């Protein structure tokens, strides 16, 4: 299938997860942050040599809690916003809402407090890859294409300005 190698094209370089265990699950959900982390990694590395440098992200200690920022170039300049994200409890067979708070407010393809909303297929290839995606791909395949349209239509609408400096 096109959407099979599409993903598989995406994902191609990033570590599989393993365990299934979300924040309650002690030693295991101990287990699965080293996963999420030793992905997060390498897709970053991976990122700096594609010259697409895109994301940062940051955990509480309990890596219950995620925020940072991504960036978005769009003819040559460079566009930054602040991205949060709590894990859900029944993770990782349900996928985290990641909020990007400066883009709240009545914008296509977002619900309120600025959840992103993705479309209909995203929601099915993770349900059929439980437990293999973790945090590297929800942004590989969720908050990286968004981008891709989202950001490009503010900036035509004029809701989103670059910031001189």
């Not at 393809?109 to 439980?130: E, Q, S």
Request: hydrophobic share 35%.
């Amino acid at each position: 299938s096109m959407a099979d190698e599409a993903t598989r094209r995406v994902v191609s370089e990033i570590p599989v997860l393993k365990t299934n265990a979300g924040p309650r699950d002690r030693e295991l959900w101990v287990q699965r942050l080293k996963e999420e982390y030793q992905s997060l990694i390498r897709y970053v590395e991976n990122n700096k040599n594609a010259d697409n440098d895109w994301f940062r992200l940051e955990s509480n200690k309990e890596g219950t809690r995620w925020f940072g920022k991504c960036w978005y170039i769009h003819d040559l300049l460079k566009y930054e916003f602040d991205i949060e994200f709590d894990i859900p409890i029944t993770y990782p067979t349900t996928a985290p809402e990641i909020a990007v708070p400066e883009l709240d407010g009545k914008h296509p393809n977002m619900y309120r407090g600025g959840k992103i909303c993705l479309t209909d297929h995203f929601k099915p290839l993770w349900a059929r890859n439980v437990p293999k995606f973790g945090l590297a791909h929800l942004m590989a395949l969720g908050l990286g294409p968004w981008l891709a349209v989202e950001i490009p239509d503010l900036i035509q609408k004029g809701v989103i300005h670059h910031k001189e400096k």
